[PDB]
Amino acid sequence: AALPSIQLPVDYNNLFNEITDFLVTFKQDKGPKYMAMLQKVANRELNSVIIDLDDILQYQNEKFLQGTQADDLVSAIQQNANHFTELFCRAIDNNMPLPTKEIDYKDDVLDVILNQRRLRNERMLSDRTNEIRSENLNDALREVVEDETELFPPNLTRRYFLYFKPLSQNCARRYRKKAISSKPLSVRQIKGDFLGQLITVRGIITRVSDVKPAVEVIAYTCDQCGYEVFQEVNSRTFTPLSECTSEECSQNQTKGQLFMSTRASKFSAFQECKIQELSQQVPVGHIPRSLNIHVNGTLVRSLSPGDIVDVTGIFLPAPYTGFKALKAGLLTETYLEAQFVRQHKKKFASFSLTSDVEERVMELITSGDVYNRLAKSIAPEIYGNLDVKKALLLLLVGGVDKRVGDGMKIRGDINVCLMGDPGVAKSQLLKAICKISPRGVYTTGKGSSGVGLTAAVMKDPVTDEMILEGGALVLADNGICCIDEFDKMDESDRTAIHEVMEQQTISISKAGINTTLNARTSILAAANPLYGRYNPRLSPLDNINLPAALLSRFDILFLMLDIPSRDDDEKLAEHVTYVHMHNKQPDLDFTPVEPSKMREYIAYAKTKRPVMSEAVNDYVVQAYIRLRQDSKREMDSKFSFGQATPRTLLGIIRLSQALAKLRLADMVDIDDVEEALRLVRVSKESLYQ
Amino acid sequence: APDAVFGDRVRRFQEFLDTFTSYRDSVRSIQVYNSNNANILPHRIIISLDDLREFDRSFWSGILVEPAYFIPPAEKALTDLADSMDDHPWKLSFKGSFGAHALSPRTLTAQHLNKLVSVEGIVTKTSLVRPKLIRSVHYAAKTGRFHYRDYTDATTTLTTRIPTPAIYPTEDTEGNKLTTEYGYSTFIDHQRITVQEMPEMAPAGQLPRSIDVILDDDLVDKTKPGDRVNVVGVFKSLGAGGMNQSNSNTLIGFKTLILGNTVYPLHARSTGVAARQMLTDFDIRNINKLSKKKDIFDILSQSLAPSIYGHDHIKKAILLMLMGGVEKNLENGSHLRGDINILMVGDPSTAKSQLLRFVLNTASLAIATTGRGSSGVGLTAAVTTDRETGERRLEAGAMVLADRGVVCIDEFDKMTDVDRVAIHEVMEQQTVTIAKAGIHTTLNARCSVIAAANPVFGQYDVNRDPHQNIALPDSLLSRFDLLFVVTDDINEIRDRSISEHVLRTHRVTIPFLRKYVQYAKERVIPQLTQEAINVIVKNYTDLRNDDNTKKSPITARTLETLIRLATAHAKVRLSKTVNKVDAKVAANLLRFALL
DNA sequence: GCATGCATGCGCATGCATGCATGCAGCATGCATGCATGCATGCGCATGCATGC
DNA sequence: GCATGCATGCGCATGCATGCATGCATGCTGCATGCATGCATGCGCATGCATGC
Numbered sequence A: 001a002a003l004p005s006i007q008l009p010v011d012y013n014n015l016f017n018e019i020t021d022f023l024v025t026f027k028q029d030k031g032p033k034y035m036a037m038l039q040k041v042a043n044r045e046l047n048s049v050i051i052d053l054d055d056i057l058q059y060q061n062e063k064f065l066q067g068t069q070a071d072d073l074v075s076a077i078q079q080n081a082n083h084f085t086e087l088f089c090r091a092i093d094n095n096m097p098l099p100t101k102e103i104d105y106k107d108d109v110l111d112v113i114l115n116q117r118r119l120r121n122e123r124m125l126s127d128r129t130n131e132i133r134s135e136n137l138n139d140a141l142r143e144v145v146e147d148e149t150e151l152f153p154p155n156l157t158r159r160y161f162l163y164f165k166p167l168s169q170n171c172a173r174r175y176r177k178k179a180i181s182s183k184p185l186s187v188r189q190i191k192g193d194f195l196g197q198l199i200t201v202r203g204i205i206t207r208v209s210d211v212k213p214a215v216e217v218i219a220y221t222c223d224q225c226g227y228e229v230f231q232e233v234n235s236r237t238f239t240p241l242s243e244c245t246s247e248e249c250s251q252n253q254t255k256g257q258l259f260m261s262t263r264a265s266k267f268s269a270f271q272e273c274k275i276q277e278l279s280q281q282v283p284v285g286h287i288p289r290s291l292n293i294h295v296n297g298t299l300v301r302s303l304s305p306g307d308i309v310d311v312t313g314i315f316l317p318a319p320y321t322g323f324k325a326l327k328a329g330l331l332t333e334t335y336l337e338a339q340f341v342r343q344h345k346k347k348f349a350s351f352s353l354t355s356d357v358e359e360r361v362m363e364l365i366t367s368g369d370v371y372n373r374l375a376k377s378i379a380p381e382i383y384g385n386l387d388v389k390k391a392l393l394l395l396l397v398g399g400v401d402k403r404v405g406d407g408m409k410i411r412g413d414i415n416v417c418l419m420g421d422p423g424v425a426k427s428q429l430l431k432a433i434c435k436i437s438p439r440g441v442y443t444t445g446k447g448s449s450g451v452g453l454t455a456a457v458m459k460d461p462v463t464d465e466m467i468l469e470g471g472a473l474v475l476a477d478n479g480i481c482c483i484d485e486f487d488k489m490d491e492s493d494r495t496a497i498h499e500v501m502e503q504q505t506i507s508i509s510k511a512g513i514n515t516t517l518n519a520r521t522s523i524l525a526a527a528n529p530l531y532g533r534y535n536p537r538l539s540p541l542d543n544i545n546l547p548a549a550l551l552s553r554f555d556i557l558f559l560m561l562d563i564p565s566r567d568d569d570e571k572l573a574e575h576v577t578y579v580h581m582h583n584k585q586p587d588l589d590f591t592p593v594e595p596s597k598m599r600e601y602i603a604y605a606k607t608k609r610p611v612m613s614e615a616v617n618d619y620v621v622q623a624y625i626r627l628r629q630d631s632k633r634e635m636d637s638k639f640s641f642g643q644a645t646p647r648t649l650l651g652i653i654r655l656s657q658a659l660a661k662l663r664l665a666d667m668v669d670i671d672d673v674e675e676a677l678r679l680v681r682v683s684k685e686s687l688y689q
Numbered sequence B: 001a002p003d004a005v006f007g008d009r010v011r012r013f014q015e016f017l018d019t020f021t022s023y024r025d026s027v028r029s030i031q032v033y034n035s036n037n038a039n040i041l042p043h044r045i046i047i048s049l050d051d052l053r054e055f056d057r058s059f060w061s062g063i064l065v066e067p068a069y070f071i072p073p074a075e076k077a078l079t080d081l082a083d084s085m086d087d088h089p090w091k092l093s094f095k096g097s098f099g100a101h102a103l104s105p106r107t108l109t110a111q112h113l114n115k116l117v118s119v120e121g122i123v124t125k126t127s128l129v130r131p132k133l134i135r136s137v138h139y140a141a142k143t144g145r146f147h148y149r150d151y152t153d154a155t156t157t158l159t160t161r162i163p164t165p166a167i168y169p170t171e172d173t174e175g176n177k178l179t180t181e182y183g184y185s186t187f188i189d190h191q192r193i194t195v196q197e198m199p200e201m202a203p204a205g206q207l208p209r210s211i212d213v214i215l216d217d218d219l220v221d222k223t224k225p226g227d228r229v230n231v232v233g234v235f236k237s238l239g240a241g242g243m244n245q246s247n248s249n250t251l252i253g254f255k256t257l258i259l260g261n262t263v264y265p266l267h268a269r270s271t272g273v274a275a276r277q278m279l280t281d282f283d284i285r286n287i288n289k290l291s292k293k294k295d296i297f298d299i300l301s302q303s304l305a306p307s308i309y310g311h312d313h314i315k316k317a318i319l320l321m322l323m324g325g326v327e328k329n330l331e332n333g334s335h336l337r338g339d340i341n342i343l344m345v346g347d348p349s350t351a352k353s354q355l356l357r358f359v360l361n362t363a364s365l366a367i368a369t370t371g372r373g374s375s376g377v378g379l380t381a382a383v384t385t386d387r388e389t390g391e392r393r394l395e396a397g398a399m400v401l402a403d404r405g406v407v408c409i410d411e412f413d414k415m416t417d418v419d420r421v422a423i424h425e426v427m428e429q430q431t432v433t434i435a436k437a438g439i440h441t442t443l444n445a446r447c448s449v450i451a452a453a454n455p456v457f458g459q460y461d462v463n464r465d466p467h468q469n470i471a472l473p474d475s476l477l478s479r480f481d482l483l484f485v486v487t488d489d490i491n492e493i494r495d496r497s498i499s500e501h502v503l504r505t506h507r508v509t510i511p512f513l514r515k516y517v518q519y520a521k522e523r524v525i526p527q528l529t530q531e532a533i534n535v536i537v538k539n540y541t542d543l544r545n546d547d548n549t550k551k552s553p554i555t556a557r558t559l560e561t562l563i564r565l566a567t568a569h570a571k572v573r574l575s576k577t578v579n580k581v582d583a584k585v586a587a588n589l590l591r592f593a594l595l
Numbered sequence C: 001g002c003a004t005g006c007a008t009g010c011g012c013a014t015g016c017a018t019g020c021a022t023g024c025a026g027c028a029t030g031c032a033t034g035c036a037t038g039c040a041t042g043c044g045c046a047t048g049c050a051t052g053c
Numbered sequence D: 001g002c003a004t005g006c007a008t009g010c011g012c013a014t015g016c017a018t019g020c021a022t023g024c025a026t027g028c029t030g031c032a033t034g035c036a037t038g039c040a041t042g043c044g045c046a047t048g049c050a051t052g053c
């Protein structure tokens, strides 16, 4: 016959019973974990349920090792993930405890509507039972009551979202399994054999769309009968209903006109993002490809452009949308439905103290010498350059931003510029700093220009609205923007950088655009002298192509010259050639700290806001007066990159604040200002040899 | 129902497989590999039309002229043999001589329809690889049963069939609802490509011709746009050319295309497809033997461009660039270069372009550029385009295509600053960064460079220092590993000798050189030794602290150049470590180039 | 043996299933157009770079 | 160092593939009607047999 049947080794009643047992029994190495979660959900303090597969595997192994039988729930969820969502939902709806907190005037409207619906359900059931008993015509009575009565289905009474997260490599390796769901893949490797599975992808996010409401079930009302009609929607488009379909109106002769009611309708928060391959994944001589990710529920706003992540999701098909004339059979398009997100580098804003992080931070503090230990760990493969490394670390930490009132604003971010002879490894330091920062961006001259910086006007595919896509300067907001070949740029880019360093904004007034952007970012630039090597026979301002003011606006301006010396060349050559023989640095009495711990400590330090006392203020004013007196005579001799100005004092203050923050203190001390002045002085020793 | 002709043809092809016993063991080997390694190999083999020609001329002509009647029998016979040997159906591929059936898109006409052809050309545009639904699986909640359906279309079989357009089932035979099981359904990959006439064969000034090719399953992503390709398949027509119904319009005809079964990439000059040669045991023995001699470097050097007189050190440098060093990746994410670059400044009749063209002809992957020939987006791939799906994409440039290869530039001094800044990043960081409206990416550009330049005054002058004669930025020269200066001074004996040499021409072979280079670059990766460490350290110190006037500056790039040259020489030696001799050779070459 | 009344077979009208076509009027459908949208193209202007004086 | 031509991105005007619906005239096909034919029956009459007589 048409539509024959087939046999599979899959029984769903067994899996439902196993799901119930796991949901009511699991113990974390206090009552059941998920029962406590469900109680918190019932009391209206939780919106999302996360199901960890490690718990399922542990439950299975616990059942096995003591003899009894058990089914492989993990693999069933992995290979057919889209079906188990509703199984888990139905199991959970059968065990949710009653709310121990009353509903008051400070709850969400959704909760009020759900509670009203449940009360209405109970009232209808009781009315039906009373009428049936009064008829005079108890399992049978409840069964007949269930048969003749409508209700609100479970999906219209839920208030939570359910997600899965994959099997970690550690658990599978300890239990001797192969965690397929958490083996990262590139978009290239994901073929049609993986459809319907729960898989993980590694990539970098390139685009994200604004959150909008996606309708799941529409609601209508009939004034004729008083029923509520619900219309499921799972397509990109739908046809609204016209006339009532309830039993009363269906059975009568005069039907009522349905009216749409947005408040009873079921909506979802929807986003769509694009993910692109990493360079190391692309084959030789090819161009990277992309992929589509769908995000729904409470997982929205968890992805921003420029993030390198590992997304988890169920790989599902979609209808074909190409040209009609090129369709050969039942072709489909693919997308990923997101279930879990992890980042390769944690943001500072999301910081939080806890036992695990606190122990590591305390160990680092106890080890002593935090300043130099952090400074020497930046690009350890580069010999020497300790002072520039201290300045770079301070740029990583930053100062304190001050709100003066009346709308005024003082920056707290520190800008640094490196300028030296060829072959001094400026680019290596630029790239290493860009890699350490959580929101770092790297640019080189002519490659990025015009709208590559700033932003441009384009149209969203998902939504039908116009938007602005940020460039290099907007992508590194609240981060570090690294610029190579600083002296070879065009005037417009120089003006944009000028404004960004000035006041952390970019103003654009062109055809179709009149707006102001936010550019709260730090600048790290590199440049070369105008004639290749530095010429000590010329004025400092004649060796560089940049305007003097632009140089003046840098807190630290480093000069790095290459004077041959038979001694230091030996050490540099030894370091480099050792680094090439092995893969590590040669020093053995010092151990470098890995990037994650540095990021953790900087995140902890960034929460401080040290204040300035009076004696330190006296010291600062005296130092400023002395330095300003000294600088004028030097600049009159045409031997200064620039005369000292109040920006120098502001830079000293910012550097002192940064050092105080590094020390994890609420007050500033004299030694911090001493170190700041020491750095600002040593910045120019190359010019006095 | 069964057909007698089909069975007779199946029996004949089984006899063919019986007489020749290479394909049987090929199938056995594929099955053995797939069993042992569980990666899974596709079930396919390749047959030679020549052997079929000696065996049965009638069957040969049938496959050539009537593939729709003779090939399915052969595939069934092969599948039967495969199923009989072992403790998906199998497919076939064709090679050998196609005779008059080897054509190009221009010379493919309506008289070749329904026959097996082999076409050559250039890939112009591919398509997105999509899945195709073949079998769906469902579930009924009220009964606990699983159902399924099969789907087919006109391009999955060579012979015409009566359509059976089955619908997608949402209900049961009794009215119950159904649930889709995406994990238990089946999907197959699908792609469509376009092939055009080669730029080096099409007539000049004339618009080109092209043909579409459809691929399925295991031949889905075997080429990229811009490749030279050879596709063997069946030239077939489909549908009705406006015949069904009235369809008053008569302009359109029958839709036609090729149902491909074999795709072969071809290597050419100045293209992105690299040359590879299969290495036999005789070749390996001879190479490993020649590795043991002491003048092996000299022999390999004198073989390069033997029609040119002298320039021995430049030949050595070109060999070193061909072999190359080793690149290093640290755990933190740092990268250390391993390529070698060469520059040549010389007089206007010194055979610079001859050596450049030799390198273009002998390197497995090389692209030829000239000073003002390519500029702007033509070098870094900085051009953007977009699909008809809406998205914007990039397309490779000269240096992006030549990743892991070499690039030849002629008239180097004729470039500008806009492209010199661009090539700085390529020559040191070996990456290309693009930031345009709607694109932010980074492309790998790990390639080596060899270039030739002219002196400022037309001829090299010894009365002035090199800075006035080269006139190129110092930062740019620092990125070139070796710089050579060649001058022609009139000398009676030298002129005589070069005269008899040029007259001789006008009245180790390269393939063995290519095999040698391929094996050396693939197999051996040496390590640094303390002896070479001391030698290189001493030489770098001496060079950095000497008063001699050089042709190029001295930095840490020179130390890294010394290491790279030593490692490349060791690579030539086939040794797994660097000795003192390799370091000394590197130092000697660097000193000769500098002084 | 002789005369009558009833079954019985012959002869004549008549109704009814079968099975073919034919003019016509109704009904689903292909067709001419009516139009929206998203993409590419060619067409100048503002300008950053290279060249000559 | 100053003035000039050139080629490279912004700022657009404008034509053209795709894809969907809508009034209408077209062409086909079921259908009511015309009809011929061969088989079955409802029935009356002329013959032969049975029953007295």
Ligand SMILES: Nc1ncnc2c1ncn2[C@@H]1O[C@H](COP(=O)(O)OP(=O)(O)O)[C@@H](O)[C@H]1O
Residues within 6 Å of the ligand: A381, A382, A383, A384, A421, A422, A423, A424, A425, A426, A427, A428, A572, A576, B336, B337, B428, B556, B557
């Ligand atoms: N102090 C140093 N220590 C180690 N390596 C160095 C040092 N200085 C230069 N190098 C090497 O020389 C090269 C310099 O190139 P790059 O990083 O572009 O710097 P720059 O742009 O200043 O020349 C790098 O590959 C680096 O490995």
Ligand SMILES: Nc1ncnc2c1ncn2[C@@H]1O[C@H](COP(=O)(O)OP(=O)(O)O)[C@@H](O)[C@H]1O
Residues within 6 Å of the ligand: B307, B308, B309, B310, B347, B348, B349, B350, B351, B352, B353, B354, B355, B502
């Ligand atoms: N050293 C040499 N040995 C053999 N032939 C040479 C040599 N130098 C020049 N020639 C001849 O002179 C011509 C020089 O052409 P080309 O390679 O363009 O020189 P260049 O690029 O220096 O002008 C070649 O055709 C070559 O045959």
Ligand SMILES: [Mg+2]
Residues within 6 Å of the ligand: A426, A427, A484
């Ligand atoms: Mg650099």
Ligand SMILES: [Mg+2]
Residues within 6 Å of the ligand: B352, B353, B354
């Ligand atoms: Mg030449």
Ligand SMILES: [Zn+2]
Residues within 6 Å of the ligand: A222, A223, A224, A225, A226, A227, A244, A245, A246, A249, A255, A256
């Ligand atoms: Zn109603």
